[PDB]
A paper describes a structure:
These d-amino acids are sensed by a single chemoreceptor MCPDRK co-transcribed with the racemase enzyme that synthesizes them under the control of the stress-response sigma factor RpoS.
The crystals belonged to space group P1 and contained two LBD molecules, organized head-to-tail, in the asymmetric unit. The final structure models correspond to residues 32–187 or 32–189 for the d-Arg and d-Lys-bound structures, respectively. To bind the ligands, Asp47 forms an ionic bond with the positively charged α-amine group of both DAAs. Further, Glu111 and Asp47 interact with the delocalized positive charge of the guanidino group from d-Arg; in a similar manner, the positively charged side-chain amine of d-Lys forms a salt bridge with Glu111. The ligands are further stabilized by hydrogen bonds with residues from all helices, namely Asn43, Thr48, Thr105, Glu111 and Asn176. Trp107, from the short loop between helix 2 and 3, forms a lid that closes off the binding site and has a stacking interaction with the ligands.
Residue numbers in the entry: 32 to 189
Amino acid sequence: SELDKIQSELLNYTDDTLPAMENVDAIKDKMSYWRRTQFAVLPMKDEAQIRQTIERNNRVQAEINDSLVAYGKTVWPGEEEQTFKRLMGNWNAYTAVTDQFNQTLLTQGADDAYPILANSLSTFEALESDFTLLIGILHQAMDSNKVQILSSVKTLNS
Ligand SMILES: NC(=[NH2+])NCCC[C@@H](N)C(=O)O
């Protein structure tokens, strides 16, 4: 039925597309904040406050990771899954860098830790661009959903 088409298009939008977009957006926001806290721990002088912040940053990393893993269970085939797979590769790359940064910040200090982040921009930028492309895919899905919904309501003008 034309009316069930409206309901299903709406349900896909409200219960699949929007939660995807909200989730990826929130993960990107958290990742971006987490990234700045990695630089934020470098001017720090007290080694116990450095330790603390790295622990908190690692907690956020795992949250990001858990959210990514959960989000990857919802991805649709095609460009999104492909993009998400790439993102997970760059995420693992970046968390490998991050674990090296943390190990180096905890051991040698910010002077020797800062280059890990500074020289690994291509690793982080690739991660960022995967989020951007993923957000682009979901933005496209949202607008395509809205077009579908608006289209399916044409039956009510009959
Ligand atoms: N759920 C998810 N992670 N991806 C699919 C989101 C867009 C899909 N509902 C659509 O194209 O309508």
